[PDB]
Write a protein that binds this ligand. Structure first.
Ligand SMILES: Cn1nnc2cc([C@@H](CC(=O)O)c3ccc(Cl)cc3)ccc21
Length: 289
C-alpha cells in the first residue's frame, strides 16, 4: 500500500494503539484504538482492509486470550468486529493466500495449538484446515508462490528451529529444512524468492541474527544481523525492504524500527515508534481518510 500500520502490543499491559508510519516523510499518525487491548496478535491486509487477528489482553482486570478478528477500514477510520475464530490464539501467526487469511497456531492458556483455520472475507467465515505437524506459538508465518510456511515457535516444551509448508490444493503440511537457529517470536516475512526469519527467542537469549530460506535451494543462509537483539518483533515488507518494529531485548521494550536493504545486505535504524512495545501486529496498506 502506502503506510506501515502497527496495532496493539505490550508495554506493562496489552495495548490498544493503532498507529501508521509513512516511509516517504518519516511521520506517525495515531488512528482509532482497537476496541479491546491485545498483544501477541498478527496483522494483515486483504482488499484494503486491515485485519487484527488473535492475541491476548494482559490487563490488571485479568488475562484473556483472543479468538477475535477485527476489521479496520482506512476510508472511515473505524474498527468493526468480524467473525471470531474457532479458538483463542495468542502469539498467533497469519498469512494471506488468494484473499483468504490463514490463522496459524498460537496459545490458549496452557493449550499450544497445531490447528490452522482459514478466513473468507466474502462470507465473513472461518473454516478449519489441516493442522500443522507441530504445535507452534510465537510462530512466524509467510506466503510465497501461494504456499504457506510456518516457521519456528514454541511447542509447549521446546523453542523450535523447525519449519513446515502447507500446500492448499493438497490440504497438507510437510516439513521443510529446519533453520540454523532456534527461534520463537521471530519476525517472518517474504522478500523475492526467500522466506526471512529475523530475531526471536531461543529460551535464553533474544536474537539479532537473520536468516533466509531459498525455496529453490531448500537451504537457509545467514544475512547481516539486525542492530538490535529482539524477540516478539513485528515485521513487514514495504517497497522491497523489510521493516522490523519493536520487540524485547531482555532489558527494554523497544521503540526501535529497523529497515533491511537486500542489495547492500545492511540494516539501518529508520525511525522510532511513539513508545516501546512488543508483540504488535503489523501490515501495509493505503493512507486513511
Ligand atoms: C523472556 N522472553 N524474552 N523473549 C521471549 C519470547 C517468548 C515467546 C514465547 C516462547 O517461546 O515461550 C514469544 C513471546 C511473544 C510473542 Cl508475540 C511471540 C513469542 C517468551 C518469553 C520471552
Amino acid at each position: 500500500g502506502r503506510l506501515i500500520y502497527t496495532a496493539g502490543g505490550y508495554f506493562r499491559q496489552s495495548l490498544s494503539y493503532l498507529e501508521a508510519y509513512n516511509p516517504s516523510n518519516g511521520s506517525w499518525l495515531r488512528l482509532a484504538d482497537l476496541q479491546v487491548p491485545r498483544s501477541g496478535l498478527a496483522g494483515c491486509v486483504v482488499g484494503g482492509l486491515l485485519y487484527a487477528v488473535g492475541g491476548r489482553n494482559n490487563s490488571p482486570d485479568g488475562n484473556t486470550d483472543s479468538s477475535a478478528l477485527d476489521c479496520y477500514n482506512p476510508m472511515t477510520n473505524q474498527w468493526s468486529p468480524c467473525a471470531s475464530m474457532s479458538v483463542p490464539r495468542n502469539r498467533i501467526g497469519v498469512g494471506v493466500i488468494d484473499g483468504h487469511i490463514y490463522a496459524v497456531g498460537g496459545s490458549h492458556g496452557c493449550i499450544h495449538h497445531s490447528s490452522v483455520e482459514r478466513y473468507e472475507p466474502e462470507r465473513d467465515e472461518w473454516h478449519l484446515v489441516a493442522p500443522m505437524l507441530t504445535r507452534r506459538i510465537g510462530v512466524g508465518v509467510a506466503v510465497l508462490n501461494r504456499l504457506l510456511y510456518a516457521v519456528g515457535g514454541f511447542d509447549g516444551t521446546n523453542r523450535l528451529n523447525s519449519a513446515e509448508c502447507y500446500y492448499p490444493e493438497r490440504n497438507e503440511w510437510r516439513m521443510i529444512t529446519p533453520m540454523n537457529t532456534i527461534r520463537s517470536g521471530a519476525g517472518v516475512c517474504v522478500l523475492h524468492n526467500c522466506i526471512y526469519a529475523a530475531g526471536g527467542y531461543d529460551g535464553q537469549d533474544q536474537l539479532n541474527s537473520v536468516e533466509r530460506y531459498d525455496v529453490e535451494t531448500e537451504t537457509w543462509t545467514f544475512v547481516a544481523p539486525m542492530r538490535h537483539h529482539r524477540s516478539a518483533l513485528g515485521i513487514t515488507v514495504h517497497q522491497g525492504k523489510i521493516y522490523v518494529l519493536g520487540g524485547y531485548d531482555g532489558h527494554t521494550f523497544l521503540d526501535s524500527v529497523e529497515c533491511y536493504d537486500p542489495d547492500s545486505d545492511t540494516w539501518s535504524e529508520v525511525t522510532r515508534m511513539t513508545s516501546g512495545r512488543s508483540g504488535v501486529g503489523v501490515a501495509v496498506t493505503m493512507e486513511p481518510c
